[PDB]
Design a protein around this nucleic acid. Structure first.
Lengths: 246, 470, 468, 242
DNA sequence: CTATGATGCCC
DNA sequence: GGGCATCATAG
DNA sequence: GTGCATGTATTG
DNA sequence: CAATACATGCAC
C-alpha cells in the first residue's frame, strides 16, 4: 500500500474499469509522472480524486472525495464530465459505490449527514463547503449573490461576443473578488472558496487565472497546498483525455 | 429635498407637477411588510396638477417593494377639495392617521408605514477632482445600488430616515444580544425592513441572525448615508464658476499638493509601497502615480501630538467617497449605529499594510486609477488585541488606541522616519503572536477613537495594476 | 362604431381600431357558479385622430359594474399593439384573435360575445307616440340601468339566437328533471351568453318553468329593442318630417274614425261591457279608434275558417311601431316550446281589461293603445289546464281556447262587418275543474298567423283613480 | 258562551297585564266595529290583537290566522311604536304570556315548509298552488330595494316627485295584474303586505285596490272587509269602548 | 393591487 | 340613527 | 432533443 | 384582475 499512497501523496482507505490507485495495483503504472494529475478529468476538482471511469460518451466517473489533503475521503462522488458539473454522492465505501451503480443500471451516511450539517452552501456542485468554524464564525461569509444570479453572471460573461464585452461583464466578478479579498482581510476564507470553486465549475477558460489568483491562495490560506498544486497543474492540464500514460 | 414627478405617469410627467403647499406636500410613500404571513408591499401616492390646465389628480402605485407595480390616475377636472379628501381618505385607509399632520406621523400596527424621501488648475488635480467630483459617476453609483445591486429598491431615503435606520439597527442589536428567536425578533425585523427597503423575490424575508449579516446591513446603511452626503456635496454653484469641479474643490476646501518623483518623500513612500504590498493580494501590484499633500484646516492644534507611538497608517476607500472625506475627513461609527457590528469596536480604522486597506479602493481593470490615504496617528499606549471584540472601547482605562495583533506585519527594526513620524516600513514579517484560546489575525490593524487623534497628511494616487485573466 | 366612454382622456380624441371583418374590439364574459365567478373583460384598440398612437383599453369587473381599466399607448407601434392585443386575447381565451369569426370557447376560459359596437294631427300624434326615439332610448336605459337585465349594452340577433339555443338546452335539461352537474355547466353557459348581475349571491338554478318564461319575455323585449332601434332609423333625402319616413316604415294605413259612427259606438260599448271587475283600480275610456290596414294580410287572411271573432290585444307603448311594421309574430321554433302554457302562436283575449293590462299605461301616462283583430278560431280546442303540447292536439283543428270561469255569453254578441263581436258582460260559463284550479278568463291562441286580420286599433285612456 | 263571541267575531277560536278583545266578550264589558276591535295601526287582518302591554312601544300579542276560515296558526307579538315586524311568540295565549313573563311546533315547521316569503314582517306567506306551482311567482325586485323605493317616495318633497317615484310600484302593480291574469296571486299578496308594512298613507288606496281584491281572489272577504275598515280608520286611538 | 360590500360596533 | 372599520370576496 | 410556452400558485 | 416566476410537456 505504502508505495501507492506515496505515489498519490494521499491516504487511501481499506463493463467498468478500476483506475487511479488501481492502475498501480494492476501494475499499469510501470511505463516524469505527476500523479497529482492521475485520472483528473476536465471537471475534477482537487477535492475529488477519480478512481473509476465508465461511459466515455458522458464521461461518467466515480472517485474518492477528500475535503482536505490531510484527511480521509468523505465520500465517493460521481459526475458525468461531458454532461454537467454536479457531483452526486456514491456511497461511503467501494461496496456501496459499486452497488449504487449496479442497482442504478449508504449513499449518505450519518457522518455524511454531519457533513451536510456542516454544509454551508452547495456552490453549483451540490456537495457543499466545509470551513472550520469558531464562536465568531470567522472563516466564511456568504457571497452577496445567489446561485442563480451567479450562474447568470457566468452565462453573460461566457456568451459575450468579445473580450471587451467579457471583461465588462466581469465587473461584478471583480467586485466580488474585491469583497473576497475583504473577507481574506478578515479571514473569512470560505467566501473565496465558494467563488473560486464556482469559477472552476463553470468550465470556461476565462476564469482560470482569477480563480487561480484566489483558490490556490485560499488553499494556501487553508493550508491545503496539495490542492494548490493540483489546481495549478490542472488549470494547465484540465483535459478531456486524462490517462497519465496517455 | 427637491420634489420631482415620478416618471411612471408618462402621459403626465411632462405636462404636470406634483402639488405642494408649504409644509404639507400632497405626496407620500408607504411601505408594509409582514414576514410571518408574507406581506411585502409598497404604495406611492402623488397629487399632480397640470401646468397648463386646471385639473388635479392622484397617482397611486403598488406592488412588491422593488418590483414596479400597478398604478392609477384619478382626475378630478379641478375639483381639488374632493381630490384632497380622496387623498386623505386613502391615507387614513392605509394608515389610520389624518394626512395634514404627516409631520407628526405615528404608524399603527397592521397598517402601512410612511417613509421620508429626498479654470486655472493643475491637470493632475483636475484628474483627481474629476475622479471624485463627477456627478455622472455618482449617479452611476446610485443606479448600481438599486438595479445592479438591489440595495435601494424604492429609491433614496432621508438623513433622518438613515438615523431611524441606525436606531432600528440598535434595537436589532439589543434583540440579537438576547438571542431569542420568537415574535418580537420577527416584528423588529419587520420594523427594519419597513424602514429599510429590501427586495427578496418569492422567498420569505430571512431572519437577520448573525452579527456578520448585521454588519452587511451596516455597510449598506453607511453607504447610503455616504450617497446622501455625496449627492448633497456636488450641488452646483452660480456666480461665474466656468468649471463646476472647482466649486466642488471649494466645497472640499483642502490644500492638496502634487509631489515630484525626485523628492525624498516620493522615493521612501514608493519603497514603502513596494515593501508593503501583501503577497496574498497577488492578483495585482500597486504603482505610485502621484502623491498629494493633505492639509485639512483646524486639525493641527486639534491633533493629539502629545501622544507617543506616532505612525503613518493607511486608509483606503472607494473611488467616489473621497470627495466627502476631502471635504470632511474620516468619521467614527455613528452613535445611533450599534457598536457590536464592528469587530474591534467603533472608531476610525487604519492599516499598516498598504494592500489590505488598498483593497477598499474598489479599483478595476478598466478603471485602474485609485487613491490611498496615509494619516499620521499618534497611537499612544496601544491595547493589544488577539481576537475580534466590539467592546474594545471599554478595555482602554485611560488608553487612546488599540492594535489588533496579526500574525504577519513589518518589524520595528526595519522602520524608517518621515517628518518626525515613525514610519513602519515593510516588508511584513512574522509577529510571533499566537492564541491558545481562539484564532490569530493574519495582519495587524490599528483602531483609533477620537477623530482628532488623526491627521491626514498625504493622499496616494495608486494605479492598481492587475494581471493576466486566464 | 361608437367609442367606449370609459377612456375619458381619449373618448373624444381617439376611435376604435378595426380591419375589415376583424374589428379590434372584444367583450368576454366568464361565469362559474361552482366557484362563484361573474366577470367581464372588454378590450378595444384605440388610435388617436390627430397623432399616430395606438392603445389597448382593457376593463374588467363584475358584469354590470363598471370596472378596472388599463390603457397601454404605443406611439404608433401598431405591431406591438396587435401583439399585446392578441396576447391578452389568447391569455384570456387560448384562441387566436385573427379568426374571431371561427370562435370556440373552452372551459376554464372566458367566452366571447357580439355587440352592436303630410298627415293629420291624430295619426301624427299616434306615430309620435310610438316612434319617439327619445322614449325608445328611455326604454333602453330603463332595461339596462333600471331593470339590470342586459347591463353592459346591446347584442346581435344571432347572439340572441345563441341565447335561444342555450335556452333550448336548459329546457331539455329541466325536462329531464336533473339539477346536477351538466345543469350547472349549461346554466353557466347561459349566463355567459346572457349578461346578468346577481350582486354578491350565487346565480340561482333555473328550477321551474317560470324562470324560463320570464327569460323568454326578457328575450322578446331584447329582440324588440334590436328590431326597433333598427327600424326607427331616421332617413335623409330632405324629408322635412322624419316621422313620415317612420310612417313609410310602418307601411300600414291608419285612419281616424268619428265618434258618432255606429262602429265606434259599438266598440266603445264593447270596451265598457267587457270591463273586468277585478281590474277596477282603473277604467278605460275610448278616446278614438283607428282603422288598421296592414299590407299583404288580405290575400293571406283565412276567411275560409268559421268561428270568426273580434279579439283584444294589448302590448307596451313602444313595440307598436314594429307591430304596425310587421304584425304580431309567433313563438320562434328555436325558443323552447314549453314556456308557453298552451304552446306557441299569437295571443288574444276576449276580455278587454285582461289583455289591456299588457299595455303598461301609467298614472302619469294615462293613454294606451288597444288592438282589435279578427281571429278565426275555426274548430277551436277547449283547454282547461295549461299544456304547452297543444300544437300536437290540433289534428285538423285550427286554434286553441283556454277556458276561463268568467266570460261573455253568446246571447249578447254583436256584429262588425260580418264578423262576430263577442260582446259582454262577463258571466259564468258553467265550466268547472274537478282536478285543479279553474281559469279566471278565456284566452285565444292561434298558430297560423294567417288566421289573424288586424281590424282596428283602439286609442284608450286608461284612467286610474285616487291614490291614497 | 263562546258562540256569541264568535258570532260577533265571525271567526272560529281554538279551545300588570290587561286582557282585551274576545275575552272582553267573556268579560261582558261590551254592555262597535269588532272587525277593527283592538286592531293597531300595523296589525294586518290576519292578526287580531288580544293582549295589550306597554303602550310606550305599543307591544301587543294577538292570535294570527292565515285565513279567516281556519284556527290561528300561531300567536304573535308586535310593537307598533317600534317596527312593522311580527314576532312569533308561542302557539297559544298561555305560551305567549309565559314568554312575556312552545314557540314553533312541528305544525308550524310544516307551515314554514309551506312559507313562500317573509313580506317585511318575517312571519311568512303560505299560498295554495297547483301541481305546476301556479298560484305564486316571485317579484322581479328584492325586498331591500323596495324598502328604498318606499323611503324615496315618502321623502319626496312634492306631488310630482312622488308621482315620478311611484313608477316602479305602478309597473309592479302592472306585473301583479299579469300574475293575476295567470293565477299567480301570491305576488299581489306579497306586494300588498309589504306596502301595508311600510305604513305610509300614499299606498292605502292602491294596496286597497290590489290586496282586498287578492283576498277576494283568495275568497277571504272577511279580511278584505277588515282591511277596508282599517285603512279607513287606522288611528292611534283604537278602543271602540274609548 | 381596486373595489365594493355584509356587517358590526360604536357616538 | 349614521359611519366607518374587520372580514370577505370577487374583479 | 431543444427552446419555449403553458398552467398554477402567490402576492399584490 | 396584472404580473410575476416556476414545474412541465410539446414543435422545429
Amino acid at each position: 500500500r505504502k508505495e501507492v499512497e506515496n505515489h498519490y501523496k494521499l491516504s487511501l482507505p481499506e463493463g467498468l474499469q478500476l483506475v487511479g490507485p488501481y492502475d498501480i495495483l494492476a501494475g499499469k503504472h510501470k511505463t516524469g509522472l505527476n500523479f497529482n494529475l492521475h485520472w483528473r478529468f476536465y471537471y475534477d476538482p482537487p477535492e475529488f480524486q477519480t478512481i473509476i471511469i465508465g461511459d466515455n460518451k458522458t464521461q461518467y466517473h466515480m472517485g474518492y472525495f477528500r475535503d482536505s489533503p490531510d484527511e480521509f475521503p468523505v465520500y465517493v462522488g460521481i459526475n458525468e464530465a461531458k454532461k454537467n458539473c454536479i457531483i452526486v454522492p456514491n456511497g461511503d465505501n467501494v461496496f456501496a459505490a459499486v452497488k449504487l451503480f449496479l442497482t442504478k443500471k449508504e449513499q449518505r451516511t450519518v457522518k455524511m449527514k454531519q457533513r451536510d450539517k456542516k454544509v454551508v452552501t452547495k456552490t453549483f456542485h451540490g456537495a457543499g463547503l466545509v470551513v472550520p468554524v469558531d464562536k465568531n464564525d470567522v472563516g466564511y461569509r456568504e457571497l452577496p449573490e445567489t446561485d442563480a444570479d451567479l450562474k447568470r453572471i457566468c452565462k453573460t460573461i461566457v456568451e459575450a461576443a468579445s473580450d471587451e464585452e467579457r471583461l465588462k461583464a466581469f465587473a461584478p466578478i471583480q467586485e466580488m473578488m474585491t469583497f473576497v479579498q475583504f473577507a481574506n482581510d478578515e479571514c473569512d476564507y470560505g467566501m473565496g472558496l465558494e467563488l473560486g470553486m464556482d469559477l472552476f465549475c463553470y468550465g470556461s477558460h476565462y476564469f482560470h487565472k482569477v480563480a487561480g489568483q484566489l483558490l490556490p491562495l485560499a488553499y494556501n490560506l487553508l493550508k491545503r497546498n496539495l490542492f494548490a498544486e493540483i489546481i495549478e497543474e490542472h488549470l494547465a492540464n484540465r483535459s478531456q483525455e486524462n490517462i497519465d500514460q496517455l | 429635498g427637491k420634489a420631482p414627478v415620478d416618471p411612471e405617469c408618462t402621459a403626465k410627467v411632462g405636462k404636470a407637477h406634483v402639488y405642494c403647499e408649504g409644509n404639507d406636500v400632497y405626496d407620500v410613500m408607504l411601505n408594509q411588510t409582514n414576514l410571518q404571513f408574507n406581506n411585502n408591499k409598497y404604495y406611492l401616492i402623488q397629487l399632480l396638477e397640470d401646468d397648463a390646465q386646471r385639473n388635479f389628480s392622484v397617482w397611486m402605485r403598488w406592488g412588491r417593494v422593488g418590483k414596479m407595480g400597478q398604478h392609477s390616475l384619478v382626475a378630478c377636472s379641478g375639483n381639488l377639495n374632493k381630490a384632497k379628501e380622496i387623498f386623505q381618505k386613502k391615507f387614513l385607509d392605509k394608515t389610520k392617521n389624518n394626512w395634514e399632520d404627516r409631520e407628526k406621523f405615528e404608524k399603527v400596527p397592521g397598517k402601512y408605514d410612511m417613509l421620508q424621501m429626498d479654470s486655472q488648475l493643475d491637470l493632475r488635480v483636475q484628474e483627481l477632482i474629476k475622479l471624485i467630483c463627477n456627478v455622472q459617476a455618482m449617479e452611476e453609483m446610485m443606479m448600481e445600488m438599486k438595479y445592479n445591486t438591489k440595495k435601494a429598491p424604492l429609491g433614496k431615503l432621508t438623513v433622518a430616515q438613515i438615523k431611524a435606520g441606525y436606531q432600528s439597527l440598535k434595537k436589532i442589536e439589543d434583540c440579537i444580544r438576547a438571542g431569542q428567536h420568537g415574535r418580537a425578533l420577527m416584528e423588529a425585523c419587520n420594523e427594519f425592513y419597513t424602514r429599510i427597503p429590501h427586495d427578496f423575490g418569492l422567498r420569505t424575508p430571512p431572519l437577520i441572525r448573525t452579527q456578520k449579516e448585521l454588519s452587511e446591513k451596516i455597510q449598506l446603511l453607511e453607504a447610503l448615508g455616504d450617497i446622501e452626503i455625496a449627492i448633497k456635496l456636488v450641488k452646483t454653484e452660480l456666480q461665474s464658476p466656468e468649471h463646476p469641479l472647482d466649486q466642488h474643490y471649494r466645497n472640499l476646501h483642502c490644500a492638496l499638493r502634487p509631489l515630484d518623483h525626485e523628492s525624498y518623500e516620493f522615493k521612501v513612500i514608493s519603497q514603502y509601497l513596494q515593501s508593503t504590498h501583501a503577497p496574498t493580494h497577488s492578483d495585482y501590484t500597486m504603482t505610485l502615480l502621484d502623491l498629494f499633500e493633505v492639509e485639512k484646516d483646524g486639525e493641527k492644534e486639534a491633533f493629539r501630538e502629545d501622544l507617543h507611538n506616532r505612525m503613518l497608517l493607511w486608509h483606503g476607500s472607494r473611488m467616489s467617497n473621497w470627495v466627502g472625506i476631502l471635504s470632511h475627513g474620516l468619521r467614527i461609527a455613528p452613535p445611533e449605529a450599534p457598536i457590536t457590528g464592528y469587530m474591534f469596536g467603533k472608531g476610525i480604522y487604519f492599516a499598516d499594510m498598504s494592500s489590505k486597506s488598498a483593497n477598499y479602493c474598489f479599483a478595476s481593470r478598466l478603471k485602474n486609477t485609485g487613491l490611498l490615504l496615509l494619516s499620521e496617528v499618534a497611537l499612544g499606549q496601544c491595547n493589544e488585541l488577539l481576537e475580534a471584540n466590539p467592546k474594545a472601547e471599554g478595555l482602554l482605562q485611560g488608553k487612546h488606541s488599540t492594535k489588533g495583533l496579526g500574525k504577519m506585519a513589518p518589524s520595528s527594526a526595519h522602520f524608517v522616519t518621515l517628518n518626525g513620524s515613525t514610519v513602519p516600513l515593510g516588508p511584513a514579517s512574522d509577529t510571533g503572536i499566537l492564541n491558545p484560546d481562539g484564532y490569530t489575525l493574519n495582519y495587524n490593524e490599528y483602531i483609533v477613537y477620537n477623530p482628532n487623534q488623526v491627521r491626514m497628511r498625504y493622499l496616494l494616487k495608486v494605479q492598481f495594476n492587475f494581471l493576466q485573466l486566464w
